[PDB]
């Protein structure tokens, strides 16, 4: 976690401006569109055989609402992610068995879904911070691994 | 392998870069540089400065191919066979890079196209990139 | 793409394997669970002690489909068909870990047949455990 | 290092037997060998045609040694091999253009020599100590990469 002064002020800028409840929604199902094999954790979620299946699953939308929601706390900790995340990585790992790959895929996901939004604004040097956090948060969640 | 599915909408999103290719190359280029600086180690001849007129240059060529990849969609491996010689065996470019400039070039097209930039299209446009990466690295050994 | 020389390579090596492949699968598993611990998320219903009956047979079971490969180093996309079905629609293991287990299997043979483990034939190896792994993973999406 | 005392001392007691002369060009090598992209940097060296060709290469066997003997010495500063590669974290990135990708084929590379050479001797639990290591090498390697 390299982040300049700028370029944490630029990650709480745009951070400003998101509706975690909509994005999660859009990152998680995306997720589960790009990458079908991440559907292996969600058989309880009900039918996510196409796309629109997947994006309006009510359950796919609560359960990305919940992720994003960690996230955010997670950028109130920019300075302490490793402790911020500590008992959820524990928990992916010795309850959910979540193998880390994916913290890093949904990362990818959710830098498209932030361009796909902010068109022109999530700048070239605004996706370089974002690029820093995720690898960041990913890295937090999968500390407590083992 | 890419379905008919994935054929048309490759070709509809490609549809809409029409003449901005050349500098949503670029970006994507300039967006990898930024984030991905390791990248720059195969570049160390460019001048990486914001609106090289090298970069500009580079994403140009890079479209090009991109959208020679989408007329020739049913053909790759030959419509590219050139430019996985010259990676191969000139560039070297390790493969790991690949997926960086794929997943550039998602954002560039994520950050122009929000009304195509569908999950379908997203998912299409992944498996295209990745296609493409395979074809110009299946000569390296 | 396998070379003739490649294909020969292999058979060589495994060849010598012989009635070992077992205990080098056993062995291959007990080295990746040690050393990428991330992978034992995917086998949360097996007791992964050193020794267990568990490994020891999941073991048996690769070694016997590397196996049935190499005699099938022609035709590979056809002789694990089943087995790229499995992994892509029910296992779903992510495709990262199969780079991890390729890893393992090398050291396991370089640790086994120093004679036979000469550079050329680590090379083919290597690109053999890439295309069976490209196999495995050709039906993910 | 994230190295346990017991994790230490196997790493530690194995390499007391290596011969770095003869690890050293064999690890440079076989990674010219198997991934011939890697030589893209040694053109200078000659003839690295064949298997042969680069096992038997002189230039290739002495830079092997070079770069297996800086290696041997950050194992005595595992504890901050961070500040034991900076120098030459800089020489790789602003003078030799190495994409710090080669760090990790090298230690992957490393780690079947070892195997390779030691049989019985590499055994699991001391492999993974060796993991850490090379890994913990290549990140340092990369760290002042900008
Ligand atoms: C930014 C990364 C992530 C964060 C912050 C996050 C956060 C959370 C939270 C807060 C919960 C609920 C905890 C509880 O039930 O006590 C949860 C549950 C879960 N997470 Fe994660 N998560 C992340 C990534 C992922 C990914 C990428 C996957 C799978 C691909 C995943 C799989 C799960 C599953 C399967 C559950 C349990 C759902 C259920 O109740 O059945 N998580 N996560
Ligand atoms: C799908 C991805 C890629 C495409 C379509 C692509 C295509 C091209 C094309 C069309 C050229 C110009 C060749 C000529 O002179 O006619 C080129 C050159 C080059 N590419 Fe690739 N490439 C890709 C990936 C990469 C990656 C990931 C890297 C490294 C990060 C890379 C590094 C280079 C370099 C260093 C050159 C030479 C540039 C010069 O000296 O002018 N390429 N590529
Ligand atoms: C070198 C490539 C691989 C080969 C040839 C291979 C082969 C096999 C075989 C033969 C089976 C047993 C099928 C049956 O039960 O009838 C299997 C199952 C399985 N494989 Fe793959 N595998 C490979 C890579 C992986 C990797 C890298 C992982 C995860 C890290 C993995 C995870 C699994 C799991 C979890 C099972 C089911 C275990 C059980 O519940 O018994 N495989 N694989
Ligand atoms: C274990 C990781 C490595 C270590 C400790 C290491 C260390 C060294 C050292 C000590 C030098 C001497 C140069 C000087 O002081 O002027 C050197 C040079 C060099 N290294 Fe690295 N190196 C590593 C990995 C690599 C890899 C994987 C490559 C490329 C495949 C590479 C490419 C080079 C090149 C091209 C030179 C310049 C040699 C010359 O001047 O001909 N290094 N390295």
Same mark, same amino acid.
């Not at chain 1, 300049?4 to 589960?32: C, F, H, I």
């Not at chain 1, 880390?100 to 040097?125: D, Q, Y």
């Not at chain 1, 370089?128 to 691994?145: D, I, M, R, S, T």
């Given at each position: 976690?390299?982040?300049?002064?700028?370029?944490?002020?630029?990650?709480?800028?745009?951070?400003?401006? =998101?509706?975690?409840?909509?994005?999660?929604?859009?990152? #998680?199902?995306? #997720?589960?569109?790009?990458?079908?094999? &991440?559907?292996?954790?969600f058989?309880?979620?009900?039918?996510?055989?196409?796309?629109?299946?997947?994006?309006?699953?009510?359950?796919?939308?609560? *359960?990305?609402?919940? =992720?994003?929601?960690?996230?955010?706390?997670?950028?109130? *900790?920019?300075?302490?992610?490793?402790? &911020?995340?500590?008992?959820?990585?524990?928990? *992916?790992?010795?309850k959910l068995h979540?193998?880390?790959?994916?913290?890093?895929?949904?990362?990818?996901?959710?830098?498209?879904?932030?361009?796909?939004?902010?068109?022109?604004?999530? &700048?070239?040097?605004?996706?370089?911070?974002?690029?820093?956090? =995720?690898?960041?948060?990913?890295?937090?969640?999968?500390?407590?691994?083992? | 392998?890419?379905?008919?599915?994935?054929?048309?909408?490759?070709?509809?999103?490609?549809?809409?870069?029409?003449?901005?290719?050349?500098?949503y190359?670029?970006?994507?280029?300039?967006?990898? +540089? !930024?984030? +991905?600086?390791?990248?720059?180690?195969?570049?160390?001849?460019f001048?990486?400065?914001?609106?090289?007129?090298?970069v500009?240059?580079?994403?140009?060529?890079?479209?090009?191919? !991109?959208?020679?990849?989408?007329?020739?969609?049913?053909?790759?491996?030959?419509? !590219?066979?050139?430019?996985?010689? !010259?990676?191969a065996?000139?560039?070297?470019?390790?493969?790991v890079? +690949?997926?960086?400039?794929?997943?550039?070039?998602?954002?560039?097209?994520?950050?122009?196209?929000?009304?195509? +930039?569908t999950?379908?299209?997203?998912?299409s446009?992944?498996?295209?990139?990745?296609?493409?990466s395979?074809?110009?690295?299946?000569?390296?050994?």
């Open positions: 976690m390299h982040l300049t002064p700028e370029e944490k002020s630029a990650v709480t800028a745009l951070w400003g401006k =998101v509706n975690v409840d909509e994005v999660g929604g859009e990152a #998680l199902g995306r #997720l589960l569109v790009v990458y079908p094999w &991440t559907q292996r954790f058989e309880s979620f009900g039918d996510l055989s196409t796309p629109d299946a997947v994006m309006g699953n009510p359950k796919v939308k609560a *359960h990305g609402k919940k =992720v994003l929601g960690a996230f955010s706390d997670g950028l109130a *900790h920019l300075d302490n992610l490793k402790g &911020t995340f500590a008992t959820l990585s524990e928990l *992916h790992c010795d979540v193998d880390p790959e994916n913290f890093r895929l949904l990362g990818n996901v959710l830098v498209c879904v932030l361009a796909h939004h902010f068109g022109k604004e999530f &700048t070239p040097p605004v996706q370089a911070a974002y690029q820093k956090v =995720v690898a960041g948060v990913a890295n937090a969640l999968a500390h407590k691994y083992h | 392998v890419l379905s008919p599915a994935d054929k048309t909408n490759v070709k509809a999103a490609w549809g809409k870069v029409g003449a901005h290719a050349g500098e190359g670029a970006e994507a280029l300039e967006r990898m +540089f !930024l984030s +991905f600086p390791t990248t720059k180690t195969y570049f160390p001849h001048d990486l400065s914001h609106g090289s007129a090298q500009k240059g580079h994403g140009k060529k890079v479209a090009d191919a !991109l959208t020679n990849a989408v007329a020739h969609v049913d053909d790759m491996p030959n419509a !590219l066979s050139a430019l996985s010689d !010259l990676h065996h000139k560039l070297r470019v390790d493969p890079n +690949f997926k960086l400039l794929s997943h550039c070039l998602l954002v560039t097209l994520a950050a122009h196209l929000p009304a195509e +930039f999950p379908a299209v997203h998912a446009l992944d498996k295209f990139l990745a296609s493409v395979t074809v110009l690295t299946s000569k390296y050994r």
